[PDB]
Structures are given as structure tokens and as C-alpha cells.
Amino acid sequence: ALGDTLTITLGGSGGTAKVLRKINQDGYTSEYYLPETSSSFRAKVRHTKESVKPNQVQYERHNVEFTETVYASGSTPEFVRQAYVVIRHKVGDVSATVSDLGEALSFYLNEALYGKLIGWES
């Protein structure tokens, strides 16, 4: 699963296509990396389940992160750009409506909404 490389098209559909390489794997976690002359691309996948409690609900959290960092130039130091998403639900929940909610969240976010969001427009 997850192949030996993770494809990413920065800029949405129709953008420049990069291909990160599988570089590490442990305990349901895996990570992809690729070096570039002025920057680098980082992508990791993690899973986790919380411990059992006497009288509570057992939940599971997924996480996916993309990270992008550019090397220093002149006096300007290095800086990194990243964005990650998580999903949380009970152990035995129905998968399909969870997928529906995920589709909702993905569809809501678009380039226009990102532009509005970065402008601190609450």
C-alpha cells in the first residue's frame, strides 16, 4: 500500500507534478521525501488509536501532512510551509458517511477560500 512514491501536484489540478520517495516506515507511520535545489518536499502519514477507558467512547485519529521548506539565501533565514489534516471517529463507525464528511471538507476548500482565509478574514 501507498506505493514506493507519493505523487503531489502543487497548484491544484493541472499543476507541476512531483514524485516524493519512500524513505522511512515504522508503526503504521510512513514518510516521503525529495530533495530540490532551492527547497524540499516532505510528506508523512500517521495513525493512532486512544487507550481504552472504563466508560467512554473509543476514537481513532488519522493524520496527513505536507511540508515545504526553502533554503536560506543571503541574510534571509530558512522557513517552512506545511498543511495537514486529521479525521476522528469511533472505532466501529460507518465508513461511508465519514467519507462523505471528508468529501464535504475537501470540496469546501478551494483557491478562492484559501485566499480569503490567509487574509485573516474570519
Partner: peptide, 11 residues
């Protein structure tokens, strides 16, 4: 391939 990210260079 052993390429991997490196520590960031101070100012």
C-alpha cells in the same frame, strides 16, 4: 538513495 533533509544553516 540516502538523500535526506539536513539541519538548517544559522544566520
Amino acid at each position: 538513495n540516502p538523500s535526506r533533509p539536513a539541519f538548517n544553516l544559522p544566520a
